[PDB]
Symmetry: C3
Subunit: 395 residues, 3 copies
């Protein structure tokens, strides 16, 4: 009776020490602890039971040598829903980490949602998120960035292209949208004084501030044009300007400086003028001399092949030369230019021979008729219509 029996159930009240292998073929059921100085193994399932305190696995750090960690680590499954206090939303938490702080944890809250928190930098190879993305800090991309949706910036300086010494960028300052440039070597900085293009956010009016060059034509459909402070409409100078029929490309307003002898010999020149004086009145008048070829400005007006005309103004290249203007008109139905005619002005007056008038002095004519009187020197000759009589008076 004070020995243990091998055939029936017994209760051992002494402390046993087993020096040989122990073999079990039925459940081991303990109400206390289990320390093993060697490794341990179980089949299929290991369960950590909970009787009021959260369950955990602890990985000891061991001695500070070899491949051992600096701190012990643990896996703990816990919560605060039943904790009674400010926060009770962390329903189920699977937490990993060490003596200092957690490394990471996954959790399901009361609302049923799952979060996987990392207390540092996550370092994946690839990322593939099926839902949203939020990043509070600066983002950097090593290659292209493609979106099926819209790119949106809430920064004034919104979109920037950097290359070489210069940064170009789009800036919305709520009043206007600017296309701006940086100083050389300040690619990430602010804008310089240049204002290449801007758009008024309210009116849509565009302003270009550093000059504009256009190729292949400009058309203003409405509102007209205002220019400060000059317009150079420079026509196409060809050798055949005198006889060149207009085309749809050459109609319109323009000017050409014809300064080459080969061409302006074909155009009208100016006239040498001689100043003469009336012996009687002392009033001067100009008399036309020889035609002299001269360079000049050819100017065209009119917008269609029906409506087109030209002015030819000569300019002096010699100290004694004078300026004379000429005009012509395009004749579509005749398919030719009208002949140049001289413009009459104070420097190129019409001549008595040009209009069919009698010269003021030294004149010769076929016949003349006088009604009231004819004075010769001091002798007046007066007809008397009532009778058939003439009177010779003198003073």
């Amino acid at each position: 009776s004070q020995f243990i029996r091998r055939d029936i159930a017994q209760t051992v009240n002494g402390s046993l020490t087993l020096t040989q292998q122990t073999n079990l073929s039925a459940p081991l059921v303990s109400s206390s602890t289990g320390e093993f100085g060697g490794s341990l193994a179980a089949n299929r399932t290991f369960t950590i039971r909970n009787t009021g305190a959260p369950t955990s696995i602890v990985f000891e750090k061991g001695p500070a040598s070899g491949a051992n960690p600096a701190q012990s680590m643990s896996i703990r499954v816990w919560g605060n829903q039943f904790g009674g206090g400010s926060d009770t939303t962390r329903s189920t938490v699977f937490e990993v980490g060490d003596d200092t702080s957690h490394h990471f944890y996954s959790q399901r809250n009361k609302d049923g949602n799952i979060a996987f928190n990392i207390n540092g930098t996550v370092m994946p190879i690839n990322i593939n998120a099926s839902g949203l993305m939020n990043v509070n800090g600066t983002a950097t991309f090593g290659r292209s960035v493609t979106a099926n949706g819209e790119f949106i910036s809430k920064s004034a300086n919104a979109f920037r292209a950097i290359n070489g010494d210069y940064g170009f960028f789009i800036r919305n300052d709520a009043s206007n949208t600017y296309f701006l440039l940086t100083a050389a070597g300040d690619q990430t900085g602010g804008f310089n004084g240049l204002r290449p293009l801007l758009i008024n956010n309210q009116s849509g009016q565009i302003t270009i501030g550093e000059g504009l060059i256009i190729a292949k034509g400009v058309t203003i459909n409405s509102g007209g044009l205002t220019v400060n402070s000059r317009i150079r409409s420079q026509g196409t100078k060809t050798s055949d300007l005198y006889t060149r029929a207009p085309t749809s490309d050459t109609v319109g307003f323009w000017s050409i400086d014809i300064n080459d002898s080969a061409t302006y010999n074909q155009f009208p020149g100016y006239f040498k003028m001689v100043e003469k004086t009336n012996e009687v009145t002392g009033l001067p008048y100009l008399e036309r001399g020889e035609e002299v070829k001269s360079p000049g400005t050819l100017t065209q007006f009119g917008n269609t092949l029906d409506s087109l005309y030209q002015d030819w103004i000569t300019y002096p290249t010699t100290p004694e030369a004078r300026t004379t203007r000429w005009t012509r008109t395009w004749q579509k139905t005749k398919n030719s230019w009208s002949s140049f005619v001289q413009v009459f002005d104070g420097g190129n007056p019409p001549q008595p021979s040009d209009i069919g008038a009698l010269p003021s002095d030294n004149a010769t004519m076929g016949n003349l008729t006088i009604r009231d009187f004819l004075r010769i020197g001091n002798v007046r000759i007066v007809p008397d219509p009532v009778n058939k009589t003439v009177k010779f008076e003198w003073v």
Copy 2:
């Protein structure tokens, strides 16, 4: 109690057929090997390694939730290592899966699929501090960045509305609708919305032709290299009005076409005025003619034409500012070689005709002249005077 084989022997191997209950500390110094289970009501510890063996069913660790109190979880959790490559069915790509989670659904899992690649799936929101990915990135949902976004490569949008800058009440954005690329604006307070009626700038995607639809202002000059210009429906080329316009030599900046309204006496007193006309009538023919009076100073338009310092001329047109005033035109030409403007000359027209003294013609009436020669006949009243060239005689007829 009788045979000595009904007690356990202490020196040799024994087989116990009774259930032992050990109430004191038990000490082992050799392997414990069971073919059955192990329940401990207290904690457990082992050295170096814990192994969960597999004999046909996947292995797991279970963390029980316990009573709903203190720091306990609402649900039990488990770590399970499993797969489906040998499962026999639709999917056999999940070779090795390390899964953590609870009664409801998994929290996360890492897996190596059959092609050998590793994936780490999170059934919710991953919440790191920093992110550093050595490879690709894909996001199916909306993305938001709290500060700048910098790329060594190209930003590419496949949206019609592709790039938007929002500030204050306005959103500006670039829109490619496949036919044209637009720079557009939103209504005030609709920064993320669609475009209004405004069309600031657009580009034809096929021709590259640009259309500006809300007006254009330019500074520091414009040049059209080709194609010319067409304007609807007027052009105001506004010249620089200075005090010395009368004697001002042209410069490379002032050559070209323009007009100036010279409306200040201080300046137009220097310019030609208009002439007063008096309408007189020939007693004989009854036909009227205009005779020039006094010159009267007047404001006017000065217009320049010509594009170079060689080729340049001006017209001066006066306009009336008094009820009886008249309009007269004048012309001049730039003389480079002489370095001066030619003097203004009067333009002759129906309202400002040339005078007989201007052209050297005899007045139609009350005229006085040096000498005259008549060839055929001279009539005075009713008396004709006719030369006979063959003889030396004149005859007097009635």
Copy 3:
């Protein structure tokens, strides 16, 4: 002797085999291993002890059947800070994975910082990062991308909008910023030959290379305008052009082709000219005939309602027709156009009656005075004013 006692401490030197349930109610303390062929369970805590070598848990793969994994997996807690060698920065590492490679690990380095490394693709639903973002490879977004800060590209081709057959993009090639277009069907490719708009990064000067259209008006504040090689300023043609007072919208330079009888019958026409000949000199002169209505160009100059004038030029639509120019001036204070006056030119010379001069032949006048001599045929008549005499001479 040599049976086990059940009331006092005993040492068992034989290998016991327990075929029935074993019940413990006090600590089990082993210096060796523990294999269980069934499941295992403990309360509250399981601890893996470390005596010089890193601790781990192993999940066996089992037979290749059912839901078993292809490879065994393990959790290992280790480090290299005390390893003595090239790298000692991995202080505490919690690593999970298999024989081929690690699946993932979290680590605290010697600097105290935490990293969570994933040896593959991380696949979350949502992402919410409180700090920075870096991606070395290509990135793709399925919807919109919004930044509170600036978007910056360091690529030449910086920003691209793709739709339909065409890709539009902004390109900074360090010298100039271009707005470029792709060939049809090459949306991700390079630019074609088109050059819609460019901006010089140094000067800000804009160049448009494929033509320009403007609506609602253009204003050049400075620098003027230069055009190659013509300007068509097309005025607004209305039915009341003859009497139409200018408005602020119609002042300025333009031309109109008035080709409809309903309108040009109101304007001056041209004059038929007849060629006459001086009986004495044989020199021809032109005499004015009938006025014939004709289409023409109406051209306006001047920029204000004070400063404004027009020229009216007629063009021939019939073989015998001639061209005549006319002029008028806007009289603001009188609120009317001055009446059209004829321009005198070689083709439309003034008539003797227009200027008050005596015709060169067959003339009639009121009175005449001669000072020097009067010749009639062969008879000279010479006054001698001093002594009061007349002389009758012959040639």
